[PDB]
Write a protein that binds this ligand. Structure first.
Ligand SMILES: [Zn+2]
Lengths: 71, 35
């Protein structure tokens, strides 16, 4: 499934993920597209900061969900 | 809608599962399956 990660510049990152993907795994996928170090990414969804050792399912991030990125 | 974990861990829970997150789902399933 694809999900969108909006940055504050306005650009939107599209990612191909699974619900079983860990947040750390997603951040690594971001590094793979943008070059951003994972240990400098803070991901938000549903007014919550995403925890590295948790997964997408732990927040109910489904297809067409959009997250926010803080640098 | 917001099916929050029954154990009150502060995280969300998958409605497809037993109303619990991925972490608590296995932890509880082990005791339910064994018993
Ligand atoms: Zn829980």
């Amino acid at each position: 499934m694809q999900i969108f990660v909006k940055t504050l510049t306005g650009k939107t990152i599209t990612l191909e993920v699974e619900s079983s993907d860990t947040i750390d795994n997603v951040k690594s996928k971001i590094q793979d597209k943008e070059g951003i170090p994972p240990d400098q990414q803070r991901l938000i969804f549903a007014g919550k900061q995403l925890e590295d050792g948790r997964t997408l399912s732990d927040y109910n991030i489904q297809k067409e969900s959009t997250l926010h990125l803080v640098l | 809608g917001p099916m929050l974990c029954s154990t009150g861990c502060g995280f969300y829970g998958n409605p497809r599962t037993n109303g619990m997150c991925s972490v608590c789902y296995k932890e509880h399933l082990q005791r339910q399956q064994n018993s």
